[PDB]
Design a protein around this ligand. Structure first.
Ligand SMILES: CC(=O)N[C@@H]1[C@@H](O)[C@H](O[C@@H]2O[C@H](CO)[C@H](O)[C@H](O)[C@H]2O)[C@@H](CO)O[C@@H]1O
Ligand SMILES: CC(=O)N[C@@H]1[C@@H](O)[C@H](O[C@@H]2O[C@H](CO)[C@H](O)[C@H](O)[C@H]2O)[C@@H](CO)O[C@@H]1O
Lengths: 150, 150
């Protein structure tokens, strides 16, 4: 079950405030006003949420997903989208996904990994994010939410 | 727009794990499995979410609401439900709401106040919660989510 939803306004997105690269769209999310971060085009793709370990309970496996949609004009997804969870002790969950060829205009949830807080791992920033920093142009990915489940 | 939703599994609820007082129901919320915290009866009513100031951005007014529903059998809402936001620097937003006579079986969002992080208010726990500790029995309040908006 879902403990937190973090919408993209809570994240730090490189170029996120520059309308050449990113747009923001207000939509309803089951009675809540949310803003989708809608990627027009960017080369330095980087979206990071930061939540403190103290936000979570100990000795419980949490899994995180990012819910996204490819637009009809999506391109540049032949390069891997890197998925990362970084814990405050240094450990990273690292994985990747190649989005090229996936059906556009359908919401899908990308799992970005799992963590557990044990012992005196009580506090410190946890980073949840996705990035691709290659010189190619990523286009047409809309971001709905980070979900953290246990 | 909504930056975070925090579902009651992320909160600390006094007696929350005791089925004499509190039940948990699995439901779908916008394609996310969530568990409603459904108050059968309790005297020490206390629900607290704790999120770090570092989860939020500076120099922005956030407002917080708790979304709840009264059941057909709801009672003991003649006593005030205390609403609180506590910031890590000591400041508290305190308010209260008397729920007696509100329409049952309809979701409503209780505003619990607003905060802004300024200067080097960079970090530390923010508490969002509601409580009534009086010797009377509170019954039939179902809790959906904490919402933090800016
Ligand atoms: C619109 C676009 O994506 N521009 C990118 C630049 O951002 C990128 O330059 C890097 O940008 C990062 C942002 O954190 C740092 O400023 C880094 O020092 C820069 O090299 C360049 C080169 O990768 O590609 C586009 O111009
Ligand atoms: C089911 C129920 O509401 N029981 C309550 C007790 O919780 C309560 O005792 C207080 O409980 C709080 C819990 O944080 C502290 O332990 C406090 O020290 C206790 O006094 C009593 C008294 O208010 O009322 C019910 O029985």
């Amino acid at each position: 079950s879902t403990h937190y939803l973090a919408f993209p306004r809570a994240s730090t997105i490189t170029w996120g405030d520059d309308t050449r690269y990113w747009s923001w769209a207000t939509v309803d999310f089951c009675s809540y006003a949310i803003e989708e971060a809608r990627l027009l085009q960017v080369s330095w793709l980087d979206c990071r949420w930061s939540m403190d370990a103290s936000d979570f309970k100990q000795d419980i496996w949490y899994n995180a997903s990012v819910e996204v949609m490819l637009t009809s004009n999506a391109s540049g997804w032949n390069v891997p989208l890197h998925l990362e969870i970084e814990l405050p002790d240094g450990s990273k969950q690292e994985s990747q996904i190649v989005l090229a060829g996936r059906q556009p205009n359908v919401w899908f949830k990308i799992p970005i990994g799992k963590f557990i807080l044990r012992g005196s791992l009580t506090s410190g920033t946890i980073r949840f994010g996705f990035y691709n920093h290659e010189g190619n142009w990523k286009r047409g990915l809309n971001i709905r939410i980070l979900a953290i489940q246990a």
